[PDB]
Amino acid sequence: HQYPALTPEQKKELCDIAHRIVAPGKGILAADESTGSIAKRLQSIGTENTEENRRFYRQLLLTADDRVNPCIGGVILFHETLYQKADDGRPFPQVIKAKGGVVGIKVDKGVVPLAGTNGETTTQGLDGLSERCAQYKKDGADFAKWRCVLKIGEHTPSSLAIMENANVLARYASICQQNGIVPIVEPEILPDGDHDLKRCQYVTEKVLAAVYKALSDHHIYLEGTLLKPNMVTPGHACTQKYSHEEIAMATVTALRRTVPPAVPGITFLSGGQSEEEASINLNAINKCPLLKPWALTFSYGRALQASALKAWGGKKENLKAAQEEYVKRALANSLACQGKYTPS
Amino acid sequence: HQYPALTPEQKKELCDIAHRIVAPGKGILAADESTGSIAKRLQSIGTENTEENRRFYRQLLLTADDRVNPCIGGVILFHETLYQKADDGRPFPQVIKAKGGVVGIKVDKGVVPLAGTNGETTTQGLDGLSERCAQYKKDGADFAKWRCVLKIGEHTPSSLAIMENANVLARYASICQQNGIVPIVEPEILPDGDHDLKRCQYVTEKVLAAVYKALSDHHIYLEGTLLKPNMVTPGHACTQKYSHEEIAMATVTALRRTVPPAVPGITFLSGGQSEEEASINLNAINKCPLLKPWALTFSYGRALQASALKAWGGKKENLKAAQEEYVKRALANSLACQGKYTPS
Amino acid sequence: HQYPALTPEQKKELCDIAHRIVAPGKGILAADESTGSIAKRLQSIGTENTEENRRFYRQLLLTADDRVNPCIGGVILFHETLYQKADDGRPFPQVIKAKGGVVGIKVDKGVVPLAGTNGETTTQGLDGLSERCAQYKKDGADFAKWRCVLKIGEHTPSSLAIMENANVLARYASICQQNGIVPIVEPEILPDGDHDLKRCQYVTEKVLAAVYKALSDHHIYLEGTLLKPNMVTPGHACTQKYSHEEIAMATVTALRRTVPPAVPGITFLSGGQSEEEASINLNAINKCPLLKPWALTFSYGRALQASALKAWGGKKENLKAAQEEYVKRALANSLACQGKYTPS
Amino acid sequence: HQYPALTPEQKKELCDIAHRIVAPGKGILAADESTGSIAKRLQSIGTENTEENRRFYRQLLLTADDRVNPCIGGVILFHETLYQKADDGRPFPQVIKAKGGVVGIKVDKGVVPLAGTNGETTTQGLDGLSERCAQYKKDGADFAKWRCVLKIGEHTPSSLAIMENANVLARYASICQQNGIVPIVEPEILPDGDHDLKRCQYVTEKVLAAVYKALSDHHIYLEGTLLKPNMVTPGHACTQKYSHEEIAMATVTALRRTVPPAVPGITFLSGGQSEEEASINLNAINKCPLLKPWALTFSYGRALQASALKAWGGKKENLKAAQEEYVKRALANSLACQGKYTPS
């Protein structure tokens, strides 16, 4: 480093956090559903949108039993959710730390259109981000989430969208690492479209290559980062059927062609997939015959808890049973990231 | 345009605004002194920093006589200053429009360090900028100012700083043009250092080339933009003495090597220069024997009003006389941007 | 310049050559038809392809009367054609210098496919180019031609092709300027396709912006260069009919949005256009109401001499008459680059 | 792949060649000493420079015993050396194939200065490279070598030099893979200078990141490539002493931060190092506690054969003994790339 951006102590801290997140059998739980998204989910389960509703939803998910201690290496919370307290009164980050995980917080402020593109958007949130990261690390958070959205179309992702999303991801990563927070670079490719699996693999390769070029450009310490990419899955309109083995082969091939080995782990996202589909795909990815020099685990916000949310149904009396459903995913996903999961 | 970013009506509006700003004999007045900067200036003149102080300072500058009608093509205001009212009670943008100018507003939220660079910084402010631009155009503002800071050092400006400042400038320009506001791209090179004039010219050429590459990348309509670059002036520690003719030659050479002709005008900045130094340099630049296909006018926040601020001295009774000093610059600067100014 | 690439004497020489090429009423004659192209032309006129055939073809074109002294500011020759001698025995560059022009030589060695693109190609020729440029300047040549080919398709020009052609153009320009030769940057967009005029303008803007970014990157002295772009003309399959005024508006708009004013002149290419079509389009471009800070002249290899080639018909006795046809274009084109041409 | 550059059969062939080159215990022998370099070496050993001299030098090295069958996975030859024949009369590629290796050929035509840089140079050789690669694959060659030179100075490597060398490396790689030849990307950093090990690591990280960005840009199939980087070794004038463990840590750290796992192997270069120094450094690199997902072997043109060249001394009678010295390195280097080498 000509002008170092991190002291060796800071690099040690970021490496420790990142490796404790993606330790074998551990994955990320995503409770980052903002007001609109959690309102949509609560409408789906027939519940009104209030702060107490999110509070008992987190009580359902965050305050689970001790069986999910190794499964959940970390959770990502929302701002109010990070500041909210449990029924017992203890703060939620304290609950997560007692459970054994690490607290994370969604940082991005949403997507804003790019002028002159076919619906391509970039993500904002960089204003005053250093102060927010300092405050969130004061509040027990040790990693952050920033979601950038790129879509596969006939003429998209354009060069402008790819480089702009990569640059804002790198800026967010630098600001996070300057404040002791491990960034999660999340270039997320939408599964919408008629594109087949080969097209998705090609676009994922290009996007990840530009992402890590931008990370190298901004002097990002790669061992203090995580990756949250979409699995290489064909579009909903694609008539060709691809087995889980083919999904795993394409995904691991893209990650081996792009992601440097200094990345501690790759935490995949749901991307509209079902819980069983995501579990089987993660198990196949962890069972790929290729050489995989980074941890391949999960960061799911829908797969782990769709069954639990349906079981709760806006009712308190189902709580334990609903919590059971959540465990029924977490343990299973702990087997998915270890390549030890057997469906049915 | 594969996917057009502006309708022809919007392009016409931006072209009209930009050309009315830099019409012959017209320049930009910069009243963008934020709380810290205006507090420093008021401490220099021995005045406390309150909202009423800024209010009567703008009353001194904005509510001048009718002799400055052609000289001042537009002014840039601060958020409170744009929302503030005069002693008569009329809003300041109404005063500016009655005077004949066009209202502008400083948009950037300040500079934030870049990790891993020798003090290089980027500028933030993109969060929710479209809504702010819509509100400001509802408030009579038609152009905006975003100041990016690049400095000439032994190993700076780095590639990272240059491309990051160019990219954020292009993003700000696209957001502004999407809301009917003409952006002023302001890559400002600090005069600090021991570098000579050749080094400053080289760095200015590289920075402007990257700036307009980024503007082309983000589909910026160049005719709806303005440029606010520093004149090619050597550092304070540079022992070599450069005549105003050499300053003009280097500046116009850099602008001809970099700036496309679609740019309606180039409004220079003070950059720590004195009022007479800036006036003479602008007059020499407008008298350069080369072919200059864009308007070369001024955007001064110190040169036009340093004498007026000193004359005011925190006292109301000097008002008219202080206003006279302001006029003593504006008329002169109207001669500087027409190449018709004679010192002494 | 941190490490200068040209001494002031070299910059003066390049500026002098470039400005003498594009002096008002002067344009470039292109005799760069390689073995395949000149063989195709001679087959079209029913003549076999030998060295003597090219020799008397150049005798037809190069050894014209004194009426074409101001019209032809320079010619571009082939390697053998540069080394060939006239019927009188004087070398062809001596003939050109006596006529009043400046000798140029085609430098590029042809196009080679880019792997992984939809037929996109880059241009080779950089190997040992400095020695060849030194030899050619020893042989009276003062400028050079390098043709890069980009095509407008559904998904082309790709980012790879655009940046690669721009980079090889900049490398060729740097090598030429290091040896006293004024490069002609020729990013040529094929008119093939169903794309309309707006698409061609957009692609031309992007290509020219990347070209001049690459020229700035390689420290090219812009005043020692020329530009040979295609006019913004719709595809052959485009059903919409665009007037010459619209062609001129789109072309000058692209050039004003992209080309810096330091470029001494822009010498357009035929691009499959007819002689009268090219003459009328150049006349309209020179009559555009916009501000055009660079010379807008011609570099034609087909328009100036198609009539002369047809008149010759592989026969010596038509020589003078065929030469007359050539003059019938050159004078007319001298009126086209001055905006003084009247059809019929 | 939107427009595939290689059929699956071609990818299989390139993967097979690349993995057979860097199979465990195998490395590259470099006999690429051009006329000037081999003349300098022969002057050092007191021998005149003729074709027969190179012929018996290759007879010394290429026609060794059967003990070097697993050690030497491949050799890189010169054009004449590839076309030369042994004393028995069998062609040298046949000798290499019988020994068990794979034939390679140096492709680059040398370094040419970059205008406007502090001595930075780029490499030429792309002209007609596809035909040469086709001919060389017809002559038994299956991989190629292209050496690009970047140097660490006070202000170098510049951005221009880094991106230009990366782009020409990617172009060479694409041309090679289009003709069944596995390219060796060789961005070689000169050890000249007073820079310490941290500076060399930083520059190596940036150069490798740009190199693989350019490889991704040109659609290079990474599994059909090899890498030939310099070990992260401080300058000759650097007063600080770095242990072999520190060299290994810095080198593997740079490779893990930059090189994707799809690269079959990384074959280091001598870089002016001694034979024992290179062997110990390679052994330490193969013994690094980090996760190394690519083969880490050698590509030495001086370390393997300096002792053999000194033992030969321009005399035939020492042949066997000199060959013994060559074996004394090869076996040792087979232990260096397996992490099984013990000095003394």
DSSP string of B235-281, one letter each residue:
-TT--S---HHHHHHHHHHHHHHHS-TT--EEEE--TT--HHHHHHH
Q: Which of B106, B112, B111, B147 is nearest to B129 (CA)?
A: B106
* Count of the separate structural domains present in chain D: 1
- DSSP structural state of residue A229: P
Rg (alpha carbons) of chain B, rounded to whole number: 19
Q: Which residues contact A33 (CB under 8 A, 6 or more apart)?
A: A41, A78, A301
Cα separation, D22 vs D268, in Å, equals 11
CA A41 to chain centre: 18
Q: Breaks in chain B follow which residues, C to N over 2.5 Å?
A: none
Give the gap in angstroms from C-alpha A57 to the nearest C-alpha of chain D.
40
φ and ψ at A188, to 5 degrees? -105, 125
Element (H, E) at D16: helix D8-21
Quick one: how far is CA C179 from the chain centroid?
Answer: 20
Query: What values do phi and psi take at A303, rounded to 5?
Result: -65, -40
Kindly list the distances between the CA atom of residue C203 and the CA atoms of A244, C50, C254, C288, in Å, as whole numbers in the listed order: 41, 39, 9, 21
Q: Distance from B158 to chain A by nearest Cα, in Å?
A: 11
The residues, any chain, with a CB within 8 Å of residue A226's CB and separated by 6 or more, are A18, A21, A22, A143, A182, A183, A184, A185, A263, A264, A265, A266, A267
Q: CA–CA distance from B193 to each of B200, B236, D155 (Å)?
A: 10, 6, 17
Q: With contact defined as beta carbons under 8 Å apart, do A69 and A100 qualify?
A: yes
CA dist., res. D81 & res. D64, Å (int)? 16
Q: Helix, strand, coil shares of chain D as percentages rounded to 5? A: 45, 15, 40
Alpha-helical segments (H) within chain C: 8-21, 35-44, 51-62, 79-83, 92-99, 129-138, 159-177, 197-217, 244-258, 275-286, 306-312, 319-336
CB within 8 Å: B126 and A127: yes
The method recorded for this entry reads cryo-EM
Any idea which residue has 């596995």 for tokens? D182
* Secondary structure of residue D36 in the 3-state scheme: helix
Of C13, C228, C275, C325, the catalytic one is: C228
Contact D280, D242 (CB under 8 A): no
State how far the Cα of C27 lies from the Cα of B228, in Å rounded to an integer.
37
| A113: nearest Cα among C159, C173, B178 | B178
Identify whether the C-beta of residue C169 lies closer than 8 Å to the C-beta of residue C125.
Answer: no
For residue C154, which residues of chain B lie inside 8 Å, CB to CB? Answer: none
Distance CA C181, CA C38 (A): 25
Could you tell me if B5 and B219 are in contact, meaning their C-beta atoms sit under 8 angstroms apart? yes
The residues near A52 (Cβ < 8 Å, ≥ 6 apart) are none
Q: What is the DSSP string of A281-344?
A: HHHHHHT-SS---SEEEEEESSTTTHHHHHHHTT-STTHHHHHHHHHHHHHHHHHHTTT-----
Task: At C226, list the tokens.
Answer: 């020329």
The tokens for D37 are: 């370099």
Compute the radius of gyration of chain D from its Cα atoms.
Answer: 19
Choose the mutation target among D7, D211, D256 for the interface with A, i.e. most A CBs under 10 Å.
Answer: D256
Task: List subunits contacting chain D, requiring 3 or more Cβ pairs under 8 Å.
Answer: A, C
Q: Please, which residues 220-259 of chain C have a Cβ atom closer than 8 Å to chain B?
A: 222, 253, 256-259
Q: Is the dihedral of CA C86, C89, C94, C98 positive or negative?
A: negative
**What distance in Å separates the CA atoms of residue B226 and residue B266, rounded to the nearest whole number?**
6
Which residue type occupies C209?
Answer: A
Q: Which two tokens stand for residue D231?
A: 């070990």
Residue type, C239: T
Is-contact B71 B332, C-beta < 8 A? no
List the domain range (segments joined by +) for residue D150. 1-344
Answer whether A166's CB lies under 8 Å from A210's CB: yes
For residues D186 and D147, the answer to whether their CB atoms sit within 8 Å is yes
Binding partners of A (≥3 Cβ pairs within 8 A): B, D
- The question of whether C287 is a catalytic residue gets the answer no
Is residue A324 among the annotated active site residues? no
D19 touches chain A (CB under 8 A): no
* Residue B78 and residue B105 in contact, taking contact as beta carbons nearer than 8 Å: yes
The full length of chain B comes to: 344
Tokens 């006939």 belong to residue: A154
- CA-based nearest residue in chain A for residue B108: A127
Task: Specify the residue for token string 């009539």.
Answer: C307
The two counts, helices (H) then strands (E), for chain C are: 12, 10
CA B65 from chain centre, in angstroms, equals 23
D125 to chain C: nearest residue by CA?
C127
